C-alpha cells in the first residue's frame, strides 16, 4: 500500500483573488447637481 497523505491535487489549486477590487461609481456629478437643481426649481414653481 502506497502512502495516502493530505496533499494538493495534481496540477494544483485554482488561482486566488487577493488584490483589492472596489468598483467605482458611475454617477457623474453634473447629473447629480442637475437633478437637484431641477427638483428645486420645480418645487419653487
Partner 1 sequence: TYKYVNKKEQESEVDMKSATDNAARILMWTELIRGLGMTLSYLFREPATINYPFEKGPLSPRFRGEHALRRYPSGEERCIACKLCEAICPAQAITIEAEPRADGSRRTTRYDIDMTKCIYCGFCQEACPVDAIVEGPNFEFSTETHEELLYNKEKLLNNGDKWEAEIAANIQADYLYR
Partner 2 sequence: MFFINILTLLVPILIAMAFLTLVERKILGYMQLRKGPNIVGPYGILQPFADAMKLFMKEPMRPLTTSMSLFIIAPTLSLTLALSLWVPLPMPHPLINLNLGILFILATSSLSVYSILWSGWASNSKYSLFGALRAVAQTISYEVTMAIILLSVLLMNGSYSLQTLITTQEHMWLLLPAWPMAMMWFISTLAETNRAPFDLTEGESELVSGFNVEYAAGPFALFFMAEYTNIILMNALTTIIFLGPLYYINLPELYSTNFMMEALLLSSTFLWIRASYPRFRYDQLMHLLWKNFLPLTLALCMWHISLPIFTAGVPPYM
Ligand X SMILES: CCCCCCCCCCCCCCCCCC(=O)OC[C@H](COP(=O)(O)OCCN)OC(=O)CCCCCCCCCCCCCCCCC
Contact positions vs partner 2 (CB under 8 A): 36, 39-40, 42-44
40 binding ligand X? (CB under 6 A): yes
Residues 1-45 that bind partner 1 (CB under 8 A): 25, 27-30, 32-33
CB of 17 to ligand X, least distance (A): 31
Is 25 exposed, middle or buried, given 0-12, 13-18 or 19+ CB atoms closer than 10 A? exposed
HSE-CB for 27 with a 13 A CA cutoff: 7
Residues found near partner 1 in the complex (CB under 8 A): 25, 27-30, 32-33
Amino acid at each position: 500500500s502506497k502512502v495516502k497523505q493530505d496533499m494538493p491535487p495534481p496540477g494544483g489549486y485554482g488561482p486566488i483573488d487577493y488584490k483589492r477590487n472596489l468598483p467605482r461609481r458611475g454617477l457623474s456629478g453634473y447629473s447629480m447637481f442637475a437633478v437637484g437643481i431641477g427638483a428645486l426649481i420645480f418645487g419653487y414653481w
